[PDB]
Design a protein around this ligand. Sequence first.
Ligand SMILES: CC(C)CCC[C@@](C)(O)[C@H]1CC[C@H]2[C@@H]3CC=C4C[C@@H](O)CC[C@]4(C)[C@H]3CC[C@@]21C
Ligand SMILES: [Pb+2]
Length: 436
Amino acid sequence: MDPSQYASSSSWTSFLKSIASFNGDLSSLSAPPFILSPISLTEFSQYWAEHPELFLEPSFINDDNYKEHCLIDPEVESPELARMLAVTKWFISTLKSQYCSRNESLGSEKKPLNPFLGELFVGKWENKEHPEFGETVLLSEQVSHHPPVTAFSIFNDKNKVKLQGYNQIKASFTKSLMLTVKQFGHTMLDIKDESYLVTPPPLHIEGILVASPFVELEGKSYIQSSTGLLCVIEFSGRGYFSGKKNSFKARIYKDSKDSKDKEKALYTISGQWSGSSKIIKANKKEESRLFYDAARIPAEHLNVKPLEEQHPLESRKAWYDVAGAIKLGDFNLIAKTKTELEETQRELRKEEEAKGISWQRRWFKDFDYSVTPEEGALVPEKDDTFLKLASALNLSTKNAPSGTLVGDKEDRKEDLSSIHWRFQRELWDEEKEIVL
Ligand SMILES: CC(C)CCC[C@@](C)(O)[C@H]1CC[C@H]2[C@@H]3CC=C4C[C@@H](O)CC[C@]4(C)[C@H]3CC[C@@]21C
Ligand SMILES: [Pb+2]
């Protein structure tokens, strides 16, 4: 049917009624075929680097050229600060990819495919137009199904720029049908020997009543560097803090201590992350400059090998029949293909439980950061990067919502674990079957 018919359709009415009895498992929502996406969440990891030049820019900034690598401020105080500005621009540039891609390609936000345990999604940005960039690899793996957890790593060996992180969410509906989503997990970006800890923001899904879902960000995201510098990004929508949706305000401070006082902000960036934003240095509000305009820079999608060459664990290969049925809008075929895949998985889980076997993750392992870790789990190292950056930001190391600070209510939750997924480059190095 035409989208204009969605809201009043029998299918949507039945869907809204199913929300009243939502059990907490988003995948249980009786969503109609017209609101289904043929893309698996394991693919979302690619959204961290769809602007190759911004992802790698920090690596080209050094003590001898930094003032030539800061468009908004040729008089930038230091290379560390020039790099923080670059990392911040990169972070902002990821937002349109992360939260607006389906609106563009599908017509609105839609229900993504719930990944199966073990699912993989790999590819690469060849950056053929920029030989100095080199190849950038994406590795994404579903390390958990109950609950859904996706781990990933994007790395550029040539320029020593590497990123790793993981993601999971917890969602609930308000009485007015707003879908509140809390993100969990974090992402770390290494630029040579300099590190950055990034925490995703919470969000809500609007437009459910009118059958035109869309993401709006809220709360805050942090970018803590090993240089001490810290960027605090606050999100808002519609009004309240800006006459336009998808708005944000980012402030860069010398350190976590200074972030307590907005007046100490070295720079203040404001605008829409899905559009244009300006930046002001210090308090010189009369000298704002364009920081980033999402509309001027088209996203660059990674190269994925043809289906014919994909391993059975690769997302698109495994979900092929389901994606095809979804595109066709065949109610019975969607139910059939999805059940076939998910039932086969349930069978595997039941067998493992009965045989005393456990699924082994391929390129990621879960490290127990608890003071009293499980006796068989891997534990972090002395100079663990997450530990030092979290300490600098005074960020909770527990499995609390992304961005939770030490002492916050969420951090004071009793019997809360501290297990985090980590990329093991060695496992990819010795990979014997998967290729790009
Ligand atoms: C019809 C619709 C209400 C079905 C449910 C859709 C959904 C709530 O599952 C979707 C809609 C928006 C999706 C989010 C969009 C963007 C991201 C950023 C990515 O880095 C991690 C996944 C994450 C956080 C998605 C999780 C699943 C979400 C939240
Ligand atoms: Pb384990």
